[PDB]
């Protein structure tokens, strides 16, 4: 009748997804690109850089408060408010629709058919299906661990969100990311989103869009109702239900390793007792919250694992809830993808600590140490400024047994160490026994020359 004008009208819309469905962070701004700083007693270089993060999800998140707007079979407007997690619902009288759960107990009795695909109803149809399988299959069958897992280091709300694929306020509201400390040397932080799926209800893509709507429905009704090239319609064609845990990992260290150290603490507990990265998980504290729909902080990460675990489980005590969903433009049944584009200031880090050099001479022969290093800094332009330093006794004759302690401040570089052994009288002749530049900056540098005139012994020990 005019179901024809729904198709014709709908068929007629022009748009590309990248356009109507985009999000964008606000042009970066200004930072100090290369600059040092002193914390924990470690001299810390600190670099900075704008990158372009470019997400592109087809698993649209779903915010608590705006939950009753997203349900399997619902029709919604593909527009900037969609792309922003507040989709506008497009209410209109409906033909009946088949929704079919994917629960374990692999049934042929899994499909239900809903007369009026309105939230409350659809919600209920799901609820039925759930506690069907839960009665007549609950243990007879068992749940395949399915998960949307994401983890990243945090720079801006704009970026963690975009990356973690979650909602910026919602996250910060629960976690409290001191993005600042982070923004300049004070702190290092990553966040993990454990999005656990227990099941996903799905909704029969309809051959022709008209098939979704009663006959009392006209195209004008739709357009006057929201529909336009700036905002075409999508069907909520699958909702994944489950449970979420967020984990916050933050540490005072600024060691290049804080990253991988975490990505690793997260995976398993083989690094936990293994002792690798031990100074870090000291200055690390962890936080885990469990999203509801209408939180613990401790220094023993094994409590965090426990919370993550308790939550890969369906239960009457821990009920599922919509979590992500999938949208199909009614036009051609393409999947809706929300193109994202945050910009941000990645502040990286590198620690450096003070060193204890140590000359020791046991040699049956007069000898000589040249020792020199460079102290490094970066200007108002982040250029490396090299301040050459040189060991007092450098070049002086020394007789066994001798020893001294040369302090090196944490920001040292190029080091360099010679040992000459005199090999006759006065300095008639001499041999070089220790000759090195670019000696590894390391908590202890131990030089030690020894033995005979004819057969010396010489070694740097780190």
CB contact burial 426-448 (16+ within 10 A = b; e otherwise): eeeeeeebbeeeebebbeebebb
What are the E-state strand segments in 115-177? Answer: 146-153
Query: Can you say whether residue 456 is alpha, beta or left, with left for phi > 0 and alpha for psi between -120 and 50 degrees?
Result: beta
Give yes or no: residues 44 and 65 share one domain. Answer: no
Contact 321, 240 (CB under 8 A): no
CB 42 within 8 A of CB 353: yes
Task: Please give the Cα distance from 66 to 21 (Å, whole number).
Answer: 18
Closest by CA to 378, choosing from 369, 387, 370, is 387
189 shares a domain with 162: yes
User: What is the domain range of residue 173?
Assistant: 147-196+243-312
How is residue 239 written in tokens?
């909702």
What are 15's two structure tokens?
A: 């748009």
* Contact yes or no for 60/21 (Cβ under 8 A): no
By the 8 A CB rule, do 409 and 430 touch?
Answer: no
- The total number of structural domains in the chain stands at 4
Structure tokens of 176? 């409290």
Domain identity same for 43 and 186 = no
Contacts of 325 (CB under 8 A, 6+ apart): 59, 60, 62, 70, 236, 238, 239, 240
Return the H-helix or E-strand segment holding 163.
helix 157-164
The structure was resolved experimentally with X-ray
Domain CATH number, residue 208: 3.90.840.10
Residues 214 and 224 in one domain: yes
Token pair 């308790």 is at which residue?
Answer: 310
Do 180 and 206 belong together in one domain? no
Tell whether 265 and 362 lie within a shared domain: no
Q: What are phi and psi of 322, to 5 degrees?
A: -55, 155
37-69: burial string, b at 16+ Cβ within 10 Å, e else: eebeebbbbbbbeeeebebeeebbbbbeeeeeb
User: Is 248 in the same domain as 395?
Assistant: no
What's the CA dihedral at 146, 159, 305, 279 to 10 degrees? 140
Question: What Rg do the C-alpha atoms of the chain give, in angstroms?
Answer: 33
Helix (H) or strand (E) holding 233: strand 233-251
Cα–Cα distance measured from residue 454 to residue 254, given in angstroms and rounded to the nearest whole number:
48
Between CA 292 and CA 295, with CA 294 as vertex, the angle to 5 degrees is: 35
Helix/strand/coil percentages in the chain, nearest 5: 20, 35, 45
Residues 220 and 235 in one domain: yes
421 within 8 A of 451, measured Cβ to Cβ: no
Q: What is the DSSP secondary structure assignment for residue 212, as one 8-state letter?
A: G
Distance in angstroms (rounded) separating the CA atoms of residues 146 and 347: 34
In three-state secondary structure terms, 78 is coil
Which tokens hold the place of 172?
């910060």
Residues 139 and 153 grouped into a single domain: no
Residues 249 and 287 in one domain: yes
CA distances from 416 to 42, 43, 61 (A): 22, 20, 57
CA nearest 190: which of 239, 89, 284, 262?
262
């Amino acid at each position: 009748k005019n179901a024809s004008d729904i198709n014709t009208g709908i068929a007629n819309l022009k748009y590309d997804s990248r356009d109507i469905l985009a999000v964008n962070g606000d042009k970066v701004e200004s930072f100090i690109p290369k600059e040092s700083i002193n914390s924990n007693g470690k001299f810390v270089v600190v670099e900075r850089e704008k990158k372009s993060l470019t997400t592109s999800p087809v698993d649209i998140l779903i915010i608590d408060s705006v939950v009753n707007r997203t349900y399997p079979g619902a029709v919604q407007l593909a527009n900037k408010a969609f792309a922003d997690n507040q989709p506008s619902l497009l209410v209109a009288k409906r033909k009946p629709l088949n929704i079919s759960i994917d629960l374990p107990g692999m049934r042929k009795e899994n499909t239900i058919t809903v007369q009026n695909p309105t939230y409350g109803n659809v919600a209920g149809a799901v609820d039925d299906l759930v506690s069907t399988w839960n009665e007549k299959y609950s243990t007879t069958h068992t749940l395949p661990a399915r998960m949307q897992y994401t983890e990243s280091m945090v720079y801006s709300k704009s970026q963690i969100a975009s990356a973690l694929n979650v909602n910026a306020k919602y996250l910060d509201n629960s976690l409290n990311i001191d993005f600042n400390a982070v923004a300049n040397g004070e702190k290092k932080v990553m966040v993990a989103a454990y999005k656990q799926i227990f099941y996903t209800v799905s909704a029969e893509l309809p051959n022709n869009p008209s098939d979704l709507f009663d006959n009392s429905v006209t195209f004008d009704e739709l357009t006057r109702k929201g529909v336009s090239n700036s905002a075409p319609p999508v069907m909520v064609s699958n909702v994944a239900y489950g449970r979420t845990v967020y984990v916050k990992l933050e540490t005072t260290s600024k060691s290049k390793d804080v990253q991988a150290a975490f990505k690793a603490l997260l995976k398993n507990n083989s690094v936990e007792t293994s002792g690798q990265y031990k100074d870090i998980f000291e200055e690390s504290t962890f936080t885990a919250v469990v999203l509801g729909g209408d939180k613990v902080v401790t220094k023993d990460f094994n409590e965090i694992r426990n919370i993550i675990k308790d939550n890969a489980e369906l239960s009457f005590k821990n009920p599922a809830y919509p979590i992500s969903y999938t949208s199909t433009f009614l036009k051609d049944n393409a999947t809706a993808a929300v193109h994202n584009n945050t910009d941000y200031i990645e502040t990286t880090t590198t620690e450096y600590s003070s060193a204890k050099m140590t000359l020791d001479h046991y040699g049956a022969y007069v000898a000589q140490f040249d020792v020199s290093w460079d102290e490094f800094t970066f200007d108002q332009n982040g250029k490396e400024v090299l301040t050459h330093k040189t060991w007092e006794g450098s070049g002086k004759d020394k007789t066994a047994h001798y020893s001294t302690v040369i302090p090196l401040p944490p920001n040292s570089k190029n080091i360099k160490i010679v040992a000459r052994e005199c090999t006759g009288l006065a300095w008639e002749w001499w041999r070089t026994i220790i000759n090195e530049q670019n000696v590894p900056l390391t908590n202890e540098i131990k030089v030690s020359i020894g033995g005979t005139t004819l057969y010396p012994t010489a070694t740097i020990s780190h």
